[PDB]
């Protein structure tokens, strides 16, 4: 009995009228509720019996649902609800949530600056070797880091409370190996604010 | 009206663990209360509830067999216990109590702090923290990188928290080799980097581990 939130990702801007989605897979007769969580903390109920606010939430917060179609509407969104939005269905076992719409403030696109870090000379007498590639205050999210002439990880960070970016560090990782391909190590990074690639590199 | 849930807990493949959680300001036996769970990054999922009152226990199939929920009316507690650890089981564990309205579920109403649970097979190990170097020689980047730590979480402060405007500290990644590894950075002037000198303080309280390095060019 699945539950389909939709969209995943929404962009919007404070004072946008907008609108969730869940789609249940069958009937539940409206045993349904909307929670909102903030990052680090834990979800708050929204709404029960899906179109019924708790005590407590913002009349901007509404929500309907008839048979498998439930919508959650903002009338005017407010910096406290860029958030994630997740329902739940009470109808029969297992209560299952959605997968989570996340709402993040859409902003104007900003290309990222890129940096290239080489290993420490206290990280290589330990034996191993890592090079960083640092994508500061882009936007939109979606973003491409290349390493190769291996097998690297990424990590993002939040939305900006003052400027609403993103950043990333990515970290390509050998010890195992001086590897086998030896010569220049380069990032390409590719962003949609970007006129083309921009590559960033040392020795 | 408050539930207030026991501890972080680390733990091997294969273990068991027992997770509490006690209610406070409101008549315990009242609320059915479920158990959630949120895996880092991911979202949530049902492992099922516990009536107080009754100590019925509804578990969602998945988890039948494996988890267990019951209930001491004596201390207004309820307790989940997860069984046959594995690496799928980390994350966040969190108790929520149900508005039960109409003696069914209706929602999540008050929730718990949230228990952390990591399971792996790693001993704890305090990070190394490297420097990240400065170069040329207009605007330039600088930082630490920890690496190798277990388990999560660390602190990482710039001038021990006297600039917050320029940081950025990254997410940690569970590493191949099943340890932690953060970096954390800023963003300055370049004519700064021979006049300033850069402060980093991490602290990871599960090895014990205080840090303060030095970031020049
Ligand atoms: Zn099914
Ligand atoms: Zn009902
Ligand atoms: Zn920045
Ligand atoms: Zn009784
Ligand atoms: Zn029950």
């Known amino acids: 009995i699945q539950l389909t939130q939709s969209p995943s990702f929404l962009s919007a801007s404070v004072g946008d009228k907008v609108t969730i989605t869940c789609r249940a897979s069958?009937?539940?007769?409206?045993?349904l509720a909307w929670y909102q969580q903030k990052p680090g903390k834990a979800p708050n109920l929204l709404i029960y019996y899906a179109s019924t606010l708790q005590s407590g939430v913002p009349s901007r917060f509404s929500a309907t649902g008839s048979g498998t179609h439930f919508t959650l509407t903002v009338s005017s969104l407010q910096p406290e609800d860029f958030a994630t939005y997740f329902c739940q269905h009470m109808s029969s076992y297992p209560l299952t949530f959605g997968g989570g719409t996340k709402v993040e403030i859409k902003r104007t696109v900003a290309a990222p600056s890129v940096f290239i870090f080489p290993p420490s000379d206290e990280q290589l007498k330990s034996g191993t070797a890592s090079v960083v590639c640092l994508l500061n205050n882009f936007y939109p999210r979606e973003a491409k880091v290349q390493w190769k002439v291996g097998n690297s990880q990424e990590s993002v960070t939040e939305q900006d409370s003052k400027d609403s970016t993103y950043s990333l560090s990515s970290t390509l990782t050998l010890s195992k190996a001086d590897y086998e391909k030896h010569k220049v190590y380069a990032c390409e990074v590719t962003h949609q604010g970007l006129s083309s690639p921009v590559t960033k590199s040392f020795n | 009206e408050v539930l207030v849930q026991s501890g972080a807990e680390v733990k091997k493949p294969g273990a068991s663990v027992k997770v509490s959680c006690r209610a406070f300001g409101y008549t315990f036996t009242g609320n059915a209360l479920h158990w959630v769970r949120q895996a880092p990054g991911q979202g949530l999922e049902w492992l099922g509830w516990?009536?107080?009152?009754?100590?019925?226990?509804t578990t969602s199939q998945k988890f039948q067999g494996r988890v267990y929920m019951t209930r001491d009316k004596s201390i207004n507690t309820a307790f989940l216990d997860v069984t046959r650890l594995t690496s799928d089981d980390t994350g966040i564990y969190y108790c929520?109590?149900?508005?039960?309205?109409?003696?069914?579920?209706?929602?999540?109403?008050?929730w718990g702090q949230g228990t952390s649970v990591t399971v792996s097979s790693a001993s704890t190990k305090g990070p190394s923290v490297f420097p990240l170097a400065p170069s040329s020689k207009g605007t330039a980047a600088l930082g630490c990188l920890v690496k190798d730590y277990f388990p999560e979480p660390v602190t990482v402060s710039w001038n021990s928290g006297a600039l917050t405007s320029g940081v950025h500290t990254f997410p940690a990644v569970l590493q191949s080799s099943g340890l932690y590894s953060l970096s954390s950075v800023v963003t300055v002037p370049s004519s700064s980097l021979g006049t300033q000198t850069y402060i980093c303080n991490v602290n990871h309280k599960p090895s014990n581990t205080k840090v303060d390095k030095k970031v020049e060019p």
């Open positions: 069958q009937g539940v007769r409206n045993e």
């Open positions: 929520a109590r149900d508005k039960y309205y109409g003696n069914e579920a209706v929602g999540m109403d008050v």
């Open positions: 516990i009536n107080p009152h009754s100590g019925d226990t």
